[PDB]
Amino acid sequence: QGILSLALKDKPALYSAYMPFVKGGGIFVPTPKRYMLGDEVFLLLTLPDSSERLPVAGKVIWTTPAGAQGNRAAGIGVQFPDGPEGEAVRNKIETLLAGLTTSDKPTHTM
Amino acid sequence: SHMITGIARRLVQDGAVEEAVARSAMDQASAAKVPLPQWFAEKKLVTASQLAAANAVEFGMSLLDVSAFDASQNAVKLVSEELLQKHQVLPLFKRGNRLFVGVSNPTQTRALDDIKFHTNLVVEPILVDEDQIRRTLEQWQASNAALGS
């Protein structure tokens, strides 16, 4: 439906959300709204480095449902578009994650 | 009374299959003593992706579109081709001590046990629909094969 929003306060939060294994980069957005894989979604993303809200016209590539086994948050994994706007978002995330890249810590996805 | 249940209810909620067909599938699966998800997979009442979406919500499992997965990061080599044929799973990704494995069947557990004892990694299942598993596995195997013999 409408505009999803995701605000990330710090680098651990960004690390949990980022999906480095997605082609072009992806980001996990917690939400109770149910989506289908391949849905196009619009996301307003705030990263820890500033209050600027980054538009992301993305694609649903991952879902976790309500009541998931274990302690997994419900939500959708959104793939970044392959043009310069999406590449810019992915670029900012991986530089913000400098030093967090090789971590073994679990994420919201994989 | 006779509420449509489980996967059939969700496929109806998702618009994938349709009331009388879902009720029939539930009853026929019961008459045949076949688990409902296996019944739907065998009878091809819906697409594999529609079934995966229903399985994910019904069994509380995450679901991934592996066509969006970066092949160069695949973890296929960690699992013997023997296990891959036996179980029809798609090893996805390794992070730290965890290996995420794509499955199309929400209740297969011996496959996960075999992979855990084979890899000695922590195995975590992720739903991937059955068509995506068979196709993507061979694509990723071609990619891995380019690395050498």
Author numbering:
A (entry chain C): 8 to 117
B (entry chain A): 9 to 157
Can you provide the manuscript's text about this entry?
Type IV pili (T4P) are thin and flexible filaments found on the surface of a wide range of Gram-negative bacteria that undergo cycles of extension and retraction and participate in a variety of important functions related to lifestyle, defense and pathogenesis. T4P filaments are produced by the polymerization of pilin subunits in a process that depends on PilB, a hexameric ATPase associated with the bacterial inner membrane, while pilus retraction is powered by another hexameric ATPase, PilT.
Native and selenomethionine PilB12-163-PilZ complexes were crystallized as described in Materials and Methods, in space group P21. Two native crystal datasets were obtained, one with the wild type sequences and another with a spontaneous P70S mutation in the PilB12-163 subunit. Initial phases were estimated by single wavelength anomalous dispersion. The asymmetric unit contains two copies of the PilB12-163-PilZ complex (chains AC and chains BD) and the overall structure of the heterodimeric complex is shown in Fig 1G and 1H. No electron density was observed for the last 6 residues of PilB12-163 and the first 8 residues of PilZ. PilB12-163 is made up of two sub-domains, a four helix ND0 (α1-α4) and an α/β ND1 (a β1-β3 antiparallel β-sheet surrounded by three helices (α5-α7) and a string of three consecutive short 310 helices (η1-η3)). The ND0 and ND1 sub-domains are topologically similar to the MshEN_N and MshEN_C domains, respectively, of the V. cholerae T4P ATPase MshE. It is noteworthy that X. citri PilB sub-domain ND0 lacks the specific amino acid sequence motifs required for c-di-GMP binding found in the MshEN_N domain. The NMR spectrum of X. citri PilB12-163 indicates that it is at least partially disordered on its own and becomes fully folded upon interaction with PilZ.
